[PDB]
Amino acid sequence: TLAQPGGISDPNLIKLVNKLQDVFTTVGVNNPIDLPQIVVVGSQSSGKSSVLENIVGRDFLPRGQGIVTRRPLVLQLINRQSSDERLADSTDKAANLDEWGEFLHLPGQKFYDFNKIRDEINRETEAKVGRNAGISPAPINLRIYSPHVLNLTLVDLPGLTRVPVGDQPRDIERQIRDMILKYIQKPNAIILAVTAANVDLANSDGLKLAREVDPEGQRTIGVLTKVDLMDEGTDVVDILAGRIIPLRLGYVPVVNRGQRDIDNKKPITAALEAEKAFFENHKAYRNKSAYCGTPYLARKLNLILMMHIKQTLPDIKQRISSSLQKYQQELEALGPSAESDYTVRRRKECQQMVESLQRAAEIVSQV
Ligand SMILES: Nc1nc2c(ncn2[C@@H]2O[C@H](COP(=O)(O)OP(=O)(O)CP(=O)(O)O)[C@@H](O)[C@H]2O)c(=O)[nH]1
Ligand SMILES: [Mg+2]
């Protein structure tokens, strides 16, 4: 299933939210948690779709050669607990009734087979922009339900290009740039600036665009793809050390599936093992290899999401404490437990509120 430790779907991460969500409910606070979006941005063919799908943990995004992603795909992960011929014709070994996808343009239809989700993304793409590299900003809206995911939104985007191809107009570059800016200009979006390691970092569209909207690198993570394709003897060590174009949140090198791996339908599990072995055996990456590969990028995102969840505790702690002192000061006047029917009931109301607020304050402390 989609539960994977260390990433955006870490089981402890989901449990933390549910515990805080009950705290918010006990105190009467609409959900204040506001998780950021995760957006891949970079030059065309840099491997953006592969990176984004690895964060989800299950394949569902079209990947390959040429111009592939030609419309924004806004994926909204939605947490839903558990409640067959519906999975009889499934070609996805990991299909289960607790996890499925829903497209906005196909209401009522559920996709338990993630290979069929990918097929529909490609189908819906061609239905709107054809089969000759046409691009459109109209997003494909996808909802994926699972008991193991957060209420998080991830965005796949077309890559920025230089020369129009096929049906693309002369100003396609500005159109794609403006398309991407819509999704990363928002203050909370986490920008995954994806650059292929087999091209000099100074040519990175992702880094240029990310630095325009996030000059201080408060929400930009560098992703260096295709490390396995670098010229023999060259490496990205100087980049990881912060010597070329420093990023506050740093860079993460990854090795995703090549085109032959795609044609052979190599499972993601075998691809992650091959990535791990690559860095552990490379003379330049054996050192601190735990900070290389897809698992480490998921750790950075996991920690950032923890930051935004915990970012709400201050206001909640102050609200619980101040509210607790208000009711305790009312219990002080009513006095210890013949008496007015109002006084007996108000004392009970205040007592119950104290017990609820005390139970809430301790839960926030144990986090
Ligand atoms: N060797 C190798 N190939 C990779 C790696 N990442 C992606 N590729 C290959 O590069 C190509 C691009 O993959 P993809 O994830 O679709 O890239 P993209 O950035 O989304 C393409 P688009 O800009 O058109 O949306 C594919 O052939 C894929 O197999 C990597 O780390 N190593
Ligand atoms: Mg893509």
Resolution in angstroms, to 1 decimal, for this deposition? 2.3
Q: Which structure tokens are listed for 183? A: 């999704």
CB burial class (10 A; 0-12, 13-18, 19+) of residue 199? middle
157 contact partners, CB below 8 Å, separation of at least 6: 39, 40, 41, 48, 69, 72, 73, 179, 180, 183
Between the CA of 143 and the centroid of ligand 1 the distance, in Å, is 24
CA angle 134, 164, 197 (to 5 degrees): 100
Say yes or no: CB of residue 195 within 6 Å of ligand 1: no
**Euclidean distance between CA atoms 231 and 228, whole angstroms:** 9
Between the CA of 238 and the centroid of ligand 1 the distance, in Å, is 23
Say yes or no: CB of residue 264 within 6 Å of ligand 1: no
The structure tokens 């072995």 sit at 277
Say yes or no: CB of residue 45 within 6 Å of ligand 1: yes
User: Within the chain, where are the H helices?
Assistant: 11-27, 48-56, 114-129, 172-184, 205-213, 237-240, 259-263, 268-281, 294-310, 313-334, 341-365
**Euclidean distance between CA atoms 197 and 225, whole angstroms:** 6
**Euclidean distance between CA atoms 367 and 362, whole angstroms:** 9
Task: Report chain breaks in the chain, C–N > 2.5 Å, as residues after which they occur.
Answer: 83, 337
Q: Which structure tokens are listed for 167? A: 């049906």
Contact 160, 44 (CB under 8 A): yes
**Euclidean distance between CA atoms 255 and 252, whole angstroms:** 10
Nearest CA-CA partner of 13 in 304, 328, 216: 304
For 5, 237, 273, 287, the CA distances from 295, given in Å and listed in that order, are 9, 18, 11, 16
Q: CA torsion angle for 329, 331, 336, 337 (degrees, to 10)?
A: 170
Between the CA of 248 and the centroid of ligand 2 the distance, in Å, is 26
Say yes or no: CB of residue 54 within 6 Å of ligand 1: no
In this structure, which residue's CA is closest to atom 23 in ligand 1? 44
